[PDB]
């Protein structure tokens with residue numbers, strides 16, 4: 001698959017992925033491409049915060065699906 | 076004034092007085108009533124037999140077991156068991172004696188109240204308290220943080236305790252205990268060729284178990300010794316005079332605790348239950364639980380159990396982990412013993428539920444004074 | 447009376463316990479002479495607001511002014527123990543039970559005083575300020591639970607939208623939550639109560655996994671060094687800023703409304719109850735963000751005076767926590783006797 005991830009800027013990260021892959025897996029691929037720490041990440045699809053355990057399949061995320069990434073600010 | 080301690084634990088009830096290091100009365104948790112009415116005639120409004128005398132007359136009686144899994148299920152029967160223990164086993168006026176009583180883990184709320192209503196309204200004790208069986212067992216070994224494995228007649232429990240408190244989110248109940256083991260022993264001895272199938276034959280096998288079974292350190296190794304030697308075969312004189320010999324059956328029966336499959340049970344063994352229980356606790360207390368596994372009850376009473384558990388938990392735990400199994404020689408009555416110590420501590424005198432409190436607040440007072 | 451002396455022997459005794467225990471002893475011994483009615487009402491109000499220093503002082507300036515009707519033996523221990531009392535944000539267990547019980551009371555109250563008309567009106571304000579990725583709330587709110595599920599969704603506005611607001615704080619920058627990921631742990635305990643803590647049997651909740659959060663003790667001026675009487679659940683809330691963005695929109699669009707103070711309080715109050723019950727935060731972890739003058743400026747200009755969830759009787763909760771502290775502390779006493787007995791038989 002090829003999903004899309006959208007930053008508050010509007011910029012679009014395009015990723016190569018499998019319905020097999022977990023959310024933890026997805027954030028890792030974001031760290032590889034953009035350098036954003038997995039623990040800083042909060043992915044959203046269908047208005048729902050995306051948990052690390054589940055699979056893209058458990059979330060009806062299919063081909064060409066577009067996800068929203070928000071990064072956390074803390075101390 | 077003497078306090079009473081009653082462990083209504085699974086099939087066997089242990090009662091006695093606090094201060095003593097042993098219960099004075101132990102007897103089955105059994106009530107039977109006549110099968111036919113023709114036997115009540117001329118018997119002075121008596122209707123019931125309780126405990127040992129009910130086992131002798133099971134031919135003329137219909138037997139009921141109120142606490143087979145450690146949870147009271149018939150309160151009409153449980154009152155008779157309690158009458159019997161107060162008036163007949165202990166020969167005491169319960170209205171003169173504060174009464175420490177014992178309850179299983181995960182006992183439903185309704186049951187703690189009912190127990191408290193009966194203890195106060197039916198027997199009119201001055202005070203009472205309710206403790207969790209496994210916690211008292213920990214106390215009898217001088218600990219307040221550890222994980223107890225309590226196993227008696229009809230139920231086994233792994234109970235993680237932190238500072239006197241059983242952690243409700245990690246308590247595990249195993250429905251495999253002493254009576255499931257006495258039945259397997261029968262099966263495997265019948266497979267050799269000695270027949271044990273009648274109720275009076277179960278009781279024979281229960282003696283051979285308690286006297287000749289042990290836990291092998293390595294199952295596979297002991298089987299080899301048995302088939303390559305006679306060193307371990309033991310003899311038993313039966314009631315008719317017949318001498319039967321016991322071979323690998325001696326250790327194959329308690330193996331069912333670590334290997335529950337021997338009985339057609341897909342659950343895990345008492346070692347993996349212990350691990351699994353410890354893994355439903357905060358990693359920040361597991362170190363203390365590993366170093367304080369306390370074995371408790373009549374089913375923990377087999378030579379070689381502690382050495383075995385030490386070896387099994389060592390194989391499931393992290394490499395760097397101090398594992399210590401504590402299994403006193405008095406471990407069968409360790410709950411009761413915890414009761415007697417607790418009930419005879421000075422500070423516990425302030426910790427009773429008083430008749431005054433019960434009248435003021437009702438049976439629910441048990442939830443606020445007995446955690 | 448002997449029991450209390452044995453409870454004051456606890457090494458873990460905090461400012462909360464002392465207030466609860468000491469008032470318990472003053473309430474038994476004095477009885478309900480109405481002259482003292484006010485001392486008891488006042489102490490409970492001071493307790494809720496975490497003004498422990500004023501209450502311990504008032505308590506001690508009441509035990510001396512009535513020693514004739516009290517045991518001076520007990521007043522002694524109370525006064526010796528007092529100057530040494532602290533509060534441990536990682537172990538404020540009696541207060542963790544009190545607030546959890548209060549939150550259920552606060553909800554019961556607003557369930558009996560609320561046309562949930564405010565919450566149906568807020569939906570418009572949320573949809574306006576929600577991020578593109580948040581779901582529009584389309585259904586109508588009939589239950590208070592649906593009102594809870596709505597207001598607790600304002601967390602989708604987090605890390606965006608509330609940033610211009612959060613950035614004007616001087617308090618939040620001293621948040622003490624550690625970034626360390628400790629995962630979740632199992633618990634059957636309600637609210638802000640800790641998982642391995644002792645509880646009444648009619649106060650359990652079905653077992654679920656709950657978040658393990660650690661304090662960063664290096665934050666200079668950290669909130670938990672500043673307010674040790676607040677139990678640490680997750681430090682300060684920045685979702686509080688999110689309720690603020692939505693609330694500002696609502697006040698702006700309902701300024702003409704005459705019952706706005708009542709309505710905004712209903713939302714603030716349900717938010718506060720819900721956060722404690724859900725385990726998300728402690729009370730001061732939310733109230734101490736809202737009371738910051740810059741955010742209070744938003745209410746003063748609309749002429750809204752928040753009550754911050756203060757009720758008229760925290761009496762049932764106060765009393766159940768006394769039962770809890772006596773329980774915890776004779777437990778500790780009893781454990782000290784047993785251990786000593788085994789060390790003399792070992």
Ligand SMILES: Nc1ncnc2c1ncn2[C@@H]1O[C@H](COP(=O)(O)OP(=O)(O)NP(=O)(O)O)[C@@H](O)[C@H]1O
Pocket residue numbers: 535536537633635636637638639640641655656657658659660661678679680724725726727
């Ligand atoms: N972010 C969160 N979301 C949901 N629940 C939370 C969150 N943070 C804490 N909790 C709850 O907090 C409750 C008890 O944990 P808590 O007692 O706050 O931790 P703790 O052991 O006191 N941490 P510390 O202060 O470091 O000792 C649980 O019931 C959790 O549900």
